[model samples]
Target: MSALPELRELIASFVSEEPPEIRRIRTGTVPDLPGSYGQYFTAWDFSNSIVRDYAMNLYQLTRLATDESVSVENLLTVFRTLDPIYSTFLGYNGFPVLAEYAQRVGQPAESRAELLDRLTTFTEYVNRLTAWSHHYFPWDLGVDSVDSLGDPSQRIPVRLTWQPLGVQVDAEIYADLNPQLATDVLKALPFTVLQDHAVVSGESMYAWAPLVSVAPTPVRERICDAPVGRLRFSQATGNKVIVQYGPTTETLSSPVLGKVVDSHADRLAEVGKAVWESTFSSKEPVWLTVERL
Candidate 1:
C-alpha cells in the first residue's frame, strides 16, 4: 500500500503549485464515457469503492514522509489515486505539471525543508479526505450489536486490503489552484441514479441488488432502480448477518442487513442530524478522532 519511493520522486517534480480557493471553483460533471450501461455502473463503482482505496493511498502519502522518489510520474500516480476522473477533468493542467516538474528539477534546488512541508501538508489533506468515510461508515454496526449481548458469534469485521494502483509520471503536479481542495471536492461527491426498478420478468425469484435476501418459491417482482432505496430480498432469512470484513464463518442475517439496506434510511438520517448538531458542524480537523459508544 505504501508508495514511499514513488512519493519522494513526485515531490522532486513540482514548479509552482496552485491555491485552494481557485481549485474549488473548477468543479463540473464528469463527461460520459463511451460504453454500455453496465460499464458505466461499473465505472461508478470507482467512486463508491472508497472503502477499498483509502488505505493504500494513506500508505503512499505517509511514505512520502521520507525518501526521494518525487518524479512527475509518481505525482501523476497520486492524483490518479485521488480520483480517476481527474485524467479528463483536469487534463490540461494535470499533464503540464509533469513536464514542469521535469524542468524544475533541472534548475538549482531550494530548501528541502520547504519542499517536505508542502508535500507533507498535501499528503495529510488527501489522507484526511480519504479517511473521512471510515469515521461515518466503519461497517461496525454488527460488531457493537453482538458485544452488547456477550455473544461472541454475533461479531464480524470488514476488510479494505487492496485497491487500484496507477502508472503515470509527474502525476502530483496538477495543481489547478488548490489540488488538496480539488481532491476533497471529489471526496464529498454524492450519489448518482443507477436504475429504478425495471421489471425484468413477472416470475423472477430475486432482487438484483447484492447482499440482500429472498423468501420462498413464490415472490412478487418489483423492479426499482434508484440511487437510494430499500433493497428488499425475497425471504426474511434468519438471525445471522454476513460479516463481510470478518471471517467467512461469522455471518449476520435478518435484522442486521435487513434494517440497513431496507428500513434504516430515515433512522440513519435522524442520527446523522443529531451527530452534526452535537459536533459543532464537524469543523474540527477532519482526521481528529471522535468516538461514540
Candidate 2:
C-alpha cells in the first residue's frame, strides 16, 4: 500500500523514537535460531512464514493508513517484533527501509519531503521483504508426483481473492534451476497438497520439507532432499498461502525454486484476503496449480 495520511501521521508522531530504542523494541517472536539447525531450511517451509510475517506486518501497518492509532510500546510489541528473524534472513539488512527508518526516526529537523520519502520507501521496503522471503524459501511442498504437466513452474502463483482489494504478484519459478524437481512437481501440476501435508506454526502459517509427503511411505521424495533438503514433523492442519506482497508459503532443505518479483501492496491484500478465506481457512486444501499463465 502506498504511504497514506494515516500511516504517515502515525509514523510522524513516532519520529521522536530513538534508533537504539527501535533496536530493543525490534525483538522477535522467534528470538533465537534453533542452534542445532542453521537458518534457511532447518524447518520445512520456514521461509514462507518469513514472507507471511513480513507481508502481514506491512498489511497491518498499511491498514493504519485508514484510521491510524499511535503507540510506542506497541512499536516494540508487534511492528518490529520480527526484526530478529528478518535479521536472520539477511545478516546485514533484512527490512532495509524499515530498519533504516529507525535511524531516521530520531529527532530529525528534516523537511516534510524527508518524512514523506521515508513513508514511501518504507512501503517499498515492506513489499520487497515479502518478495525476497519467497525467493529465499522456495517450494518444499512434498513432491506429490514427479509426473509432468502444463508446467508446474508455469503457475498461477497460488492465488485467491477478496472483493475488497486486489493485486496478483507473479512468482518466478526458476524451474530451470532444478529442472528435475520442476518435472517432479509438474507431474502433479495443479497439484493438490493438503494442509495435512505441511507443517503448521504459531497457529497460523504452515511449512513442508522436500523430504516427505503427507501420504504414507509410498509417497515421498522421488529425488531425495536436496543437499538443499531434508526435514520432518513438518505438516499440521491449517496451511496458508498468501501474505504480504507475495506468497508467504514455506519450504525446507528445499532448493531455491522461485520468487515474486515486485511490490504491489494494495492488491496483495486482496489476494491475501481471498487466500485466507479459501485455502487457509482450515477448510479448503491448498492446490498448487500450473493451470494458467
Candidate 3:
C-alpha cells in the first residue's frame, strides 16, 4: 500500500504556515578557524542540526520498515525522545500528551484518524521550534580558515572560536538568548561535562583563558550559577592558568582572543527586530516551506 493518505494531509495542514528562510551570507577570511565550522554559524544551521539529528534518530529506529510504510512504533519512539525537547521549547506538556494518546490509541493497528492527530501535533511542535530557532539565533558567519576567528564577510561575525571549550561557551551564551528553550537544548548537547570549570587539561591553558575571561556576562553568570561556582581562572606558573571547577581544577595554556563574543550577543538580540522590519513589517503574506524528512 502507498503511504497513508491521512498522514500526508495531516502533515500538510500542520505545515501550512510559511517557515523562515535559511539564507547564507559570505563572511570574509576568519583567522584560526576552519571552513567546516562556518556551516554552523547561523540560526539556520542550528535549526537544521536539531532536525537532522532527531530525524536520523527516527530513521534509525524505523530502518527496518517497508519503504512504502512508516512505522507507528518507530514514530512513537521518536516522539518519546522529541517530546521533552519540544515541550521545553514550546512551553507545553509534551510527553504526557504522547503518553496519554499512546494509552488511548493502539499501536500499529491504531486508526488512521488517531494516528493523524498524533502526528499533526508532533509536526506542529517541530514547526514552532524551527521558527523560534530562526527568530532567536539567526547570525551566520562564513569563514575560510580555522573556526576560531571572529571575521565574517557580510555583517560583523560573532567573533569566537569553535574549539570544544569555545563551543561550550558559545552554547552557554546562546542559551542565554532564551534560557527556557536553552535548558533543554543544552542538556541535549553532546558535551558530557555541563558544570562550570570542569578542569580541562591537554589544551593550551593560555589560549583558552582569554576566551573564558571575555565570555559574555550572561554566559559567565550561567557558568557561575553552577553548583560548583563559576569557571575561575588563576594565573599559573609559566603562562598557564588553573581552571577551577568548584573543587576540581585543571590547568591549560592561553593566547588572547576579542569583542566577537559580546558583539555577537548584541547582534543576536536585534535579529528578530531586523528580520521583522525586512520581512514581516511589510505586511505581505510571505510563504515559505517548512521541510521535513
Candidate 4:
C-alpha cells in the first residue's frame, strides 16, 4: 500500500519512455529507488514491457554514472545484467558507453570523475539527438553512432519536413510512439504523397490520408496510436494516416505516427477541411514536399 505511489511513478517513467526522456527524468530527479527495487534493478529482471528493460537498464546505469555513492562494480554488474536483455536504440548506445566506463574504472590512472564526464557527454548526446529529430525505434532508427564520439556521428544536421497539400509542415516523430508507422512515413519519403482523403469540417478534425505506395512494399500495418495533433493510421482505415487536431479526442481506432508541428497543426487541418468541403479530387496527388531542415 505504501509502495503505491512510488510504484505508480516508477511505472509512468518507463511504460513507454524514449531515451532522452528517461535521461531527463534522471536529471537530478531519479530517487535512489528504495532498496527493495535494487535486485530487480536491471533489464533482465523486467520482463513484461519491451521498454521497461531499456528504461530500467538506463536508470541503473545512469545512477551508476551520476551517483558517486554507486560503485563501479555496481555499474559492471548492471551492465552484465542488461547484456542479455533486448531494449531500445539508446539502450544499445548506452551499453557500450557503460562498458567503456566499467573497463576504465579499474585503471590506475583513470579518474572516476573523468569517466563520469564521458558518460555524461553521451547522455547529453542522447538529449540533443531527440531534439534533432524523431527517433522512432531500433528498426526505423537513423541513428548511426560510430563509437558515441563525434557525439556519435558525422552526419548532416537536418530534419525531415513534409508539405501536405502544399501546406509546409515541420513535425517531430517520437520513435517510441508508433515506430513502424513513423518509419513508414520517413522511409516513404521525397514524394511520398498521401491523399487528403478525409471527412473533415471546420467544426471537427475528421481528416485522414493514406500513404501512396512507393513501390514493392508498403509501410507497417494495423496499429492504433492516436493523440491530439498526432498522425495515425489503422487496420480499419486500411492503414490510412489519420490526423488528430480536433478540439477533442477522436476514435480513429488508430495510433499515432507523428504530429503536425504545433505551429502548423491548425493550418494543415484547415487546409484539409477546405479541400474536403470543396469536394475536389477524392484521389488527388498531394504536393507534399519533403524537406530536410
What TM-scores do the predictions have?
0.25, 0.28, 0.23, 0.33
Candidates sorted by lDDT, descending order? 4, 2, 3, 1
- Residue-level lDDT of model 1, residues 7-71, one tens digit each, is 34432321112222112212212243422453433332332243224324433433443446575
In candidate 2, what are the lDDT values of residues 8-32, reduced to their tens digit? 5433333222222223212222334
Which stretches of model 4 miss by more than 4 angstroms?
1-166, 200-228, 248-252, 278-286, 290-292
The lDDT of model 2 is 0.33
Q: What is the lDDT of residue 170 in candidate 4?
A: 60
In model 3, what lDDT does residue 1 have?
35
Off by over 4 Å in 3: 1-78, 81-112, 140-293
In model 1, where do residues sit more than 4 Å from their true spots? 1-40, 49-61, 67-111, 132-293
Please give the TM-score that candidate 3 achieves against the real structure. Answer: 0.23
**Cα error, candidate 3, residue 268 (Å):** 27
Q: Rank the candidates by TM-score, best first.
A: 4, 2, 1, 3
Note the residue pairs that clash in candidate 4. 135-175, 136-175, 149-152, 159-293, 224-254, 224-255, 225-254, 225-255, 225-256, 226-255
RMSD to the hidden true structure, all candidates: 19.3, 18.8, 20.4, 19.7
After TM-score superposition, the amount by which residue 27's alpha carbon in candidate 2 deviates from its true location, in angstroms, is 26
**Prediction 3 global C-alpha lDDT:** 0.28
List, in order, the clash count of every candidate structure.
45, 15, 24, 10
